[PDB]
Structures are given as structure tokens and as C-alpha cells.
């Protein structure tokens, strides 16, 4: 059972420009001293057809972990458009916030993110040349999908990984 549990995430700047940074306030609880590091990662899903287009946006490595309620704000740089398959750039995708203990992932938070041109005429008639500066993004901040994984913290599975 989890020594570290995530208590909340706030998406601070939303909706936003495609090229705006992602601002999050993350709140978590650490119940007892841990020997190793926590690592929070933010991944942007570049293509739904494969993991090969994932872009890691940021990574916050914390060690040692302070015991008790921890609250922190960070700002992550946006994905770069050039790396995203053209036909998927201006459509819905997913971003993932995960956390790991000693490199073992124990929680993952997903949000849907829609991308849309900011003006009528472009929406109805998108250009062959993607105009990144007119893309607005909208994170479905009210609907986090949170998935936990059991891991070993600092320690009797009869069928271990």
C-alpha cells in the first residue's frame, strides 16, 4: 500500500496557446521517511498510433522526500510542433503526469487535451501549412483519469515481477 499518495492537481493556465507553458500545482502526501527519490514526469502524447511520438516535457526529481503534505508549482515547456505528425497536430490528444519511486511508477494521471484553430475561417478551411501560432489548447481539467500501480517501497509477493 502507498507511502506516497497524490492528493490533487490544479491546471493553472487553461485554455492556452499551443506554445504556452503548462502550469501545474501538484499536492501529495508522504506518510513516512523514504530512502529514495520521487520523480514526476509530464509527457505529451504526440500520436495515438504509437508511443514513438511521445514527448517528455519535464521531469522533477525530488530526494529525499519530505514527510507530510507537499505542495509545489511548476511550469513545463510545450511540446514542439515539428515533432508531431502533421495530421495529428490540430486534434485531440492526451497528456500524462506520472510519478515514480526509486524509478518504479506508482501513479499516472491522464487528461484529454483538445487542439483547435482560434478563428472560424481556419477551423473550416485548415491550411496545408499548419499555423502553430493560431492553435489554442484546452485541457479537460475537470476529468483527470488516475491510475495506481502497486510497487515495492522500502521492503511478500509470491509471484513478484
Amino acid at each position: 500500500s502507498s507511502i506516497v499518495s497524490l492528493l490533487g492537481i490544479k491546471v493553472l493556465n487553461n485554455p492556452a496557446k499551443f506554445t504556452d507553458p503548462y502550469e501545474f500545482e501538484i499536492t501529495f502526501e508522504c506518510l513516512e521517511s523514504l530512502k529514495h527519490d520521487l520523480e514526476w514526469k509530464l509527457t505529451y502524447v504526440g500520436s495515438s498510433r504509437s508511443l514513438d511520438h511521445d514527448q517528455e516535457l519535464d521531469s522533477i526529481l525530488v530526494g529525499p522526500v519530505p514527510v507530510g503534505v507537499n505542495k509545489f508549482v511548476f511550469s513545463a515547456d510545450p511540446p514542439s510542433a515539428e515533432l508531431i505528425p502533421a495530421s495529428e497536430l490540430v486534434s485531440v490528444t492526451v497528456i500524462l503526469l506520472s510519478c515514480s519511486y526509486d524509478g518504479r511508477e506508482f501513479v499516472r494521471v491522464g487528461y484529454y487535451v483538445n487542439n483547435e484553430y482560434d478563428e472560424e475561417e481556419l477551423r473550416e478551411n485548415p491550411p496545408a501549412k499548419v499555423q502553430v501560432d493560431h492553435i489554442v489548447r484546452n485541457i479537460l481539467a475537470e476529468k483527470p483519469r488516475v491510475t495506481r500501480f502497486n510497487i515495492v517501497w522500502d521492503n511478500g509477493d509470491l509471484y513478484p515481477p
Binding site: 492528493l7 490533487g8 492537481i9 476529468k143 483527470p144 488516475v146 491510475t147 500501480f149 509471484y159
Partner: protein
């Protein structure tokens, strides 16, 4: 490619019922083969575990309690924080 590869465990009307159950209103025709591939990965994961448990217990057949335990090893996805 060959017949064994194309054996399926869920019909098209069944996929349409499940999608309606999930609040879906309209689907592309490509949803059928996508849903089937997803069901297959799920089943492979659970059955691999269930069978492992069965073999270590030397049982003749896979029992409900091997499957029930295998299902507990699947991650659960919740709708907010704390649960």
C-alpha cells in the same frame, strides 16, 4: 492472414451493445477491429497470470479464484484523486 488468427470472441452486435452501454452514439466502421485487438491484449494479460497460478497449484483446470486474483493484478483507473 490465416483462419486461427481471425477467431473472435465478441460479435459486431455485441460491440455495438457495449458501446451504447458506455454512452457512445456513433462509431466508425474501424471500431470493430480496434475493439477486438484491445480485448485480445486484455485477455492475454489476465489469462497468462491465471494460468501461472493454475500451474503452481498443480490444478487440472483453471478455477474462478485464479482468474479473480489475476483480475486484481490489473491496474484500476479512477475519476479523481483519493479512492
Amino acid at each position: 492472414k490465416v483462419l486461427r488468427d481471425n477467431i473472435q470472441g465478441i460479435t459486431k452486435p455485441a460491440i455495438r451493445r457495449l458501446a451504447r452501454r458506455g454512452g457512445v452514439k456513433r462509431i466508425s466502421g474501424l471500431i470493430y477491429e480496434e475493439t477486438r485487438g484491445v480485448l485480445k491484449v486484455f485477455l492475454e494479460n489476465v489469462i497468462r497470470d491465471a494460468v501461472t497460478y493454475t500451474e503452481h497449484a498443480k490444478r487440472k483446470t483453471v478455477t474462478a479464484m485464479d482468474v479473480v486474483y489475476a483480475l486484481k493484478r490489473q491496474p484500476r483507473t479512477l475519476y479523481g484523486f483519493g479512492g
